[PDB]
From Swiss-Prot:
Summary of activators and inhibitors of this protein: Activated by phosphorylation. Competitively inhibited by alpha-D-galactose-1-phosphate.
Subcellular location per the Swiss-Prot or TrEMBL entry: Cytoplasm
Chain residues that bind beta-D-glucose 6-phosphate: D10, G46, V47, R49, S116, K117, N118
Binding of Mg(2+), residues: D8, D10, N170
Result when mutating G46V: 10'000-fold decrease in catalytic efficiency
Note: The catalysis proceeds via a phosphoenzyme formed by reaction of an active-site nucleophile with the cofactor glucose 1,6-diphosphate (G1,6-diP). The phosphorylated mutase binds either G1P or G6P and transfers the phosphoryl group to the C(6)OH or C(1)OH, respectively.
pH dependence (UniProt free text): Optimum pH is around 7. Relatively stable in solution within the pH range of 5-9.5.
Name this protein carries in UniProt: Beta-phosphoglucomutase
Cofactor: Mg(2+)
Outcome of substituting T16P: 500-fold reduction in the rate constant for Asp-8 phosphorylation by beta-G1,6bisP. 6,700-fold reduction in the apparent rate constant for cycling of the phosphorylated enzyme to convert beta-G1P to G6P
Family (UniProt): Belongs to the HAD-like hydrolase superfamily. CbbY/CbbZ/Gph/YieH family.
UniProt PTM: Autophosphorylated.
Known outcome of mutating K45A: 20'000-fold decrease in catalytic efficiency
Length: 219
């Protein structure tokens, strides 16, 4: 039987992408740049804070000093941190609290494998801290998704190998990272995005202990 489940945060436990988008849009309005919409925002996902800002400036060929650039970037982060003060237990995705309860009661380890610099804080705001055995620190990995480093780190932190683990993700890069770690992926989304060679469920309500056990047996 699998010994651990490795969770991403965004797209699995809750939505942080909406708050990043609102913070970038507010920044662009402040500096007078048009075109930061949700389609455009697809180009900012999984990209560094600095590269995202540059893509926004390039919409208007807008030049700023190195100083101004550093401070516009920090300003957007400050706004994002303000916005997530309102996250609550009601923001947890369907199925996820019941899964955490069932994993804990069956002595299966629970770890976070997220790029979020605010993971510990967000789990505290959602009242989930007491379910998690470890949180991998994204500041300590040498390579980001699709590299396997953050999934290796999450597994190791709870005393298991990835090969003993299931990983849950909604992104192409995260699924590849789980695959290359040695863990078993179960995606949430559609195979058109995530692949034909893994099990995929259409939404998080399908993530049940019974289903995870079925997928592990059949792998
Ligand atoms: Na995700």
């Amino acid at each position: 039987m699998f010994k651990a489940v490795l969770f991403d945060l965004d797209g699995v436990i809750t939505d942080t992408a909406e708050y990043h988008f609102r913070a970038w849009k507010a920044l662009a309005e402040e500096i007078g740049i048009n075109g930061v919409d949700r389609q455009f925002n697809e180009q900012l996902k999984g990209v560094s804070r600095e590269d995202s800002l540059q893509k926004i400036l390039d919409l208007a060929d807008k030049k700023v000093s190195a100083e101004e650039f550093k401070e516009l970037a920090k300003r957007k982060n400050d706004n994002y941190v303000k916005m997530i003060q309102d996250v609550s237990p009601a923001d947890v995705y369907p199925g996820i609290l019941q899964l955490l309860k069932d994993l804990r009661s069956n002595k299966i380890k629970i770890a976070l494998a997220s790029a979020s610099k605010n993971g510990p804080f967000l789990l505290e705001r959602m009242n989930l801290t007491g379910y998690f055995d470890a949180i991998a620190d994204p500041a300590e990995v040498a390579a980001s998704k699709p590299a396997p480093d953050i999934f290796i780190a999450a597994a190791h932190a709870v005393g298991v190998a990835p090969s003993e683990s299931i990983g849950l993700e909604n992104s192409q890069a995260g699924i590849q990272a789980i695959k290359d770690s040695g863990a078993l992926p179960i995606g949430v989304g559609r195979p058109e995005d995530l692949g034909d060679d893994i099990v995929i469920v259409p939404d998080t309500s399908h993530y049940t202990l019974e289903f995870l056990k079925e997928v592990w047996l059949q792998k």
